[PDB]
């Protein structure tokens, strides 16, 4: 009754203190520091490969760490592993549930995880002693669809869900070591820091949170957007990240100063971002949109410079290689281009 | 370079064997129709599954493989996981036409399914599911549809209506008022790319999977006629 309103008044005053601590450390905006640097140019990438074997819309892809093999998931229940140099498909893994909303590729290359509307995160063993691709585990503790999954070892995948819960698992025994709570709505994508000591998570409540992986506790919360956050990615030096929401705007948050630095919005783009990823230098910010075409944002001036094209439907997945060579973008027309 | 040529050879020999099976899967996957079946908690979709986070129910009428799947595992918010279903033939939307207190909730859900960027090309098969409970409730008289819908006092049974022989002129007016509510939400925005096919169903209808066959056949025939610049 009265204690709830009292604690809510204290929480409001404390949020005002947080806001005043964030507006005091606002010396000058990133656009003012970057007014003296040269523009990026006009990045004109061309489709160096078109990978076509999927029956239905491609919902997620992930690059191997060798920057050559990639895995892609489509809603026909197929998880195909391509050789992006020769455009041969190494494996074609027939899933159990068609509705696969994500996939990952073990940072060593041994295992592959997927998992969608069946609330579990299946994990597949690629290099088996018999040569067959079988299911290694099925992590089945989530209550709601599974909207991302990022390997952290050969044993320690972390997983986002459609029940506001990220859950760090333990693939050996098969049960979640930690559970990260604090989001209000569906949590849509996560992105491990390059050292994997912490990660960020974007949710359908217009907010992102920074999770310590060891302590299992929300470190910081970033809320500057206006609608669902569909895509998130870390800056290559792990000290910043970019959210892409459905209010048709990408933003660059920084974990240190704890604010928003850039806003990647224009007055003609009224379609929402479905994917983001940086370039190996952290200057180009790829961003897949609903108007069926990616962009390439100069991520220090906010000026567009470059536009990708050539997809029939919305661009769902988008990921730069680990060495910075290519940029593979899948889309709901079941074709996976590769740019350069 | 013999080892490298053997690498490329045994890689092509595997891509060929994979694309063979994948063409087989393409043949199978296209002779099968997917049908997102969604309703409400009390609607009665569980009883139209007449066979985890999804209850797939395969059935086959007239040698065509239908593949219907209720989605129960997820929580109440459905704005993100429903985009997964923009490639289904139909969307079977089942509603109980008896509980008037929760009929505007179904009207709003239908209006949000209809006017959605990704479901804007999917046609809905509308099942009005508890016709016998509706007959009972409206023949009793304690429940008045004009308390929840003030424009039921100025409604007149359609002329093209087909009142089943043996029923009251009150049950028919009640049925068709709700059917016309959904149909007017339909036609107010649907520009020929998707349609709504309303039906009246009980819980004992044994000919309820033929009515999905006849409506999917029509959905797809209109799709073909419309892509041949022929409608």
């Amino acid at each position, epitope marked *: 009754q009265s204690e709830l309103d009292q604690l809510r008044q204290e929480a409001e005053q404390l949020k005002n203190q947080i806001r005043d601590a964030r507006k005091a450390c606002a010396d000058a905006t990133l656009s003012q520091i970057t007014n003296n640097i040269d523009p990026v140019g006009r990045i004109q990438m061309r489709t160096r490969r078109t990978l076509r074997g999927h029956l239905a819309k491609i919902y997620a892809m992930h690059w191997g760490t060798d920057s050559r093999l990639l895995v892609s998931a489509s809603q026909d229940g197929k998880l195909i592993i391509w050789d992006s140099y020769t455009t041969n498909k190494v494996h074609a893994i027939p899933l159990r549930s068609s509705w696969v909303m994500t996939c990952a590729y073990a940072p060593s290359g041994n295992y592959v995880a997927c998992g969608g509307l069946d609330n579990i995160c299946s994990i597949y063993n690629l290099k088996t002693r018999e040569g067959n691709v079988r299911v290694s585990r099925e992590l089945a503790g989530h209550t709601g669809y599974l909207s991302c999954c990022r390997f952290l070892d050969d044993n320690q995948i972390v997983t986002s869900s459609g029940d506001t819960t990220c859950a760090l698992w333990d693939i050996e025994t098969g049960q979640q070591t930690t559970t990260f709570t604090g989001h209000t709505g569906d949590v849509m994508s996560l992105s491990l820091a390059p050292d994997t000591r912490l990660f960020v998570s974007g949710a359908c409540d217009a907010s992102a949170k920074l999770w310590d992986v060891r302590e299992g506790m929300c470190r910081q919360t970033f809320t500057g957007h*206006e*609608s669902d956050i569909n895509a998130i990615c870390f800056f290559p030096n792990g000290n910043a990240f970019a959210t892409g929401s459905d209010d048709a705007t990408c933003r660059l948050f920084d974990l240190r100063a704890d604010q928003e630095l850039m806003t990647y919005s224009h007055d003609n783009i009224i379609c929402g971002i479905t994917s983001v990823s940086f370039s190996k230098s952290g200057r180009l910010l790829l961003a897949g949109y609903d108007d069926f075409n990616c962009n390439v944002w100069d991520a220090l001036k906010a000026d567009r410079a470059g536009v990708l094209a050539g997809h029939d439907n919305r661009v769902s997945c988008l990921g730069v290689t680990d060495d910075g060579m290519a940029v593979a973008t899948g889309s709901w027309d079941s074709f996976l281009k590769i740019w350069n | 370079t013999e080892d490298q040529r053997n690498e490329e050879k045994a890689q092509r020999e595997a891509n060929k064997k994979i694309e063979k099976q994948l063409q087989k899967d393409k043949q199978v996957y296209r002779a099968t129709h997917r049908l997102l079946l969604l309703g409400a908690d009390n609607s009665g979709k569980s009883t139209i599954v007449k066979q985890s986070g999804i209850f797939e129910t395969k059935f086959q009428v007239d040698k065509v493989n239908f593949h219907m799947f209720d989605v129960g595992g997820q929580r*109440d918010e459905r704005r993100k996981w429903i985009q997964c279903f923009n490639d289904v033939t139909a969307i079977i939307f089942v509603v109980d036409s008896s509980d008037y207190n929760r009929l505007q909730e179904a009207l*709003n859900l239908f209006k949000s399914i*209809w006017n*959605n960027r990704w479901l804007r090309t999917i046609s809905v098969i509308l099942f009005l599911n508890k016709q016998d409970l509706l007959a009972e409730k409206v023949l009793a008289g304690k429940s008045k549809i004009e308390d929840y819908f003030p424009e039921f006092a100025r409604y007149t049974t359609p002329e093209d209506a087909t009142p089943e022989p043996g029923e009251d002129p009150r049950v028919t007016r009640a049925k068709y008022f709700i059917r016309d509510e959904f149909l007017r939400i339909s036609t107010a925005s649907g520009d020929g790319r998707h349609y709504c096919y309303p039906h009246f169903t009980c819980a004992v209808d044994t000919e309820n999977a033929r009515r999905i066959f006849n409506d999917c056949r029509d959905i797809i025939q209109r799709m073909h006629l419309r892509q041949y610049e022929l409608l």
Partner: nanobody
């Protein structure tokens, strides 16, 4: 941060009038189709009345038709609901929802039990 704080009224007699105001802030008001949902004591969430981006396509729930008048003021980032001829069936808390995405005609999952873009609510108790 997206916030929508309502400021309505308290106790009225059956047949009374009351005007709920919902100062929306933290986001561009003009791009979203606002709403009004209510929760009657001992019941679930139900939708009362919406309004499009401009104030052109109004809609109502049956029970609220003729009595309530939803009107937005895009200049001051606020949403109004005028209530006339209040009945005891209208006792509830009135949340001022808004819609998930902008520039959309579908307002999806707006009466969900835990929904993100929605006010704390104001209690409109009509009695004697």
């Amino acid at each position: 941060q997206v916030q929508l704080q309502e400021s309505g009224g308290g106790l009225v007699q059956p047949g009374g009038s009351l005007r709920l105001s919902c100062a929306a802030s933290g986001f561009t008001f003009s791009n979203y189709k606002m709403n009004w949902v209510r929760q009657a004591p001992g019941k679930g969430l139900e939708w009362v009345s919406d309004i499009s981006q401009s104030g052109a396509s109004i809609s109502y729930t049956g029970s609220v038709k003729g009595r309530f008048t939803i009107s937005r003021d895009n200049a001051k980032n606020t949403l109004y609901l005028q209530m006339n001829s209040l009945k005891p069936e209208d006792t509830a808390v009135y949340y001022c929802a808004r819609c998930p995405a902008p520039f959309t005609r579908d307002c999806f999952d707006v009466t969900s039990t835990t929904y993100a873009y929605r006010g704390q609510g104001t209690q409109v108790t009509v009695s004697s």
